[PDB]
Design a protein around this ligand. Sequence first.
Ligand SMILES: O[C@@H]1[C@@H](O)[C@@H](O)CO[C@H]1O
Ligand SMILES: O[C@@H]1[C@@H](O)[C@@H](O)CO[C@H]1O
Ligand SMILES: [Ca+2]
Ligand code: NA
Length: 330
Amino acid sequence: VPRGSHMEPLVTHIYTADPSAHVFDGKVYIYPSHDIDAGTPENDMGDHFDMRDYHVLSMNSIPGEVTDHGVALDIKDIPWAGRQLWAPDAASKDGKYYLYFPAKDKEDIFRIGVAVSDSPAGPFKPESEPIKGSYSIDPAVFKDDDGKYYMYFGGIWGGQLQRWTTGEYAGHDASKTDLEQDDAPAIGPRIALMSDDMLSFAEPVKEISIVDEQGNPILGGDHDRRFFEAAWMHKYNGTYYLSYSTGDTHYIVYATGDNPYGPFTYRGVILNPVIGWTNHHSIVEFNGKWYLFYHDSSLSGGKTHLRCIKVTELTHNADGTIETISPYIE
Ligand SMILES: O[C@@H]1[C@@H](O)[C@@H](O)CO[C@H]1O
Ligand SMILES: O[C@@H]1[C@@H](O)[C@@H](O)CO[C@H]1O
Ligand SMILES: [Ca+2]
Ligand code: NA
């Protein structure tokens, strides 16, 4: 039956999270995490998220019937992976489709890998090693209008971004949160231009600067505004929109800039807090309307690690500002 009419769960037969929505072949393809009831210890390192595979979803219309294409990738077939298949994304180039996914390697260090298919629905063959120079979590691979592709990535706390300041992993006894200097600039998300073949980075990884309306860096103590995880990039009216989750304050927020690398100026809230601790989203244009894909823990009765994806219309104003969505009002 058709789904996505009144902020209802898009699917209920499996738990889904962290939706990355794209328009490929005139359809909406969604690349979410596949939540399972692993029953592992819940803690601020995210051990309760013990996902093991990905399913690709698709819709021909919103609202519309949602197709589950089966298992697109299974952790048992990813040679380098140890555990934890977290928030993925996909990209399309020259008739090939690439699934980008964060997972811990056998040394328990998050890296980002790629898997390749001839179809947006998968299934995908994983590369035997993760992307050289990748680390941490939550990739978003953005195709700019000029044909260049960029990976945005990173997540603090359990996403380990705070352990990568030197370009090498600081170890499992390093910070469990952030820099632990609340008056220094907050940690920024990462960006790299993708190689022509989409399997590697074409440059050294850069950090993105996020600033307030005065041009001052967002500080580490500013948990309402500072980057936590779930980076996403979209463009509107020639402006670049970096949106992301603030984690412990439970917002999706956005910041605007004039190029892929920023800096980005914090503008405001995209999505207020949902049921369940995590908040993770994507923003996509389909048939001339903009949509916010997101999740909550409503279907599971509030279990942090058993989420369901939802969608609602997102409204840009002509001046580039976006109307804040509150999830349970209409
Ligand atoms: O990577 C995501 C993270 O952003 C958070 O939403 C928890 O679930 C993981 O899959
Ligand atoms: O620290 C983790 C973070 O990495 C994400 O998985 C959300 O839950 C938090 O506990
Ligand atoms: Ca994401
Ligand atoms: Na607002």
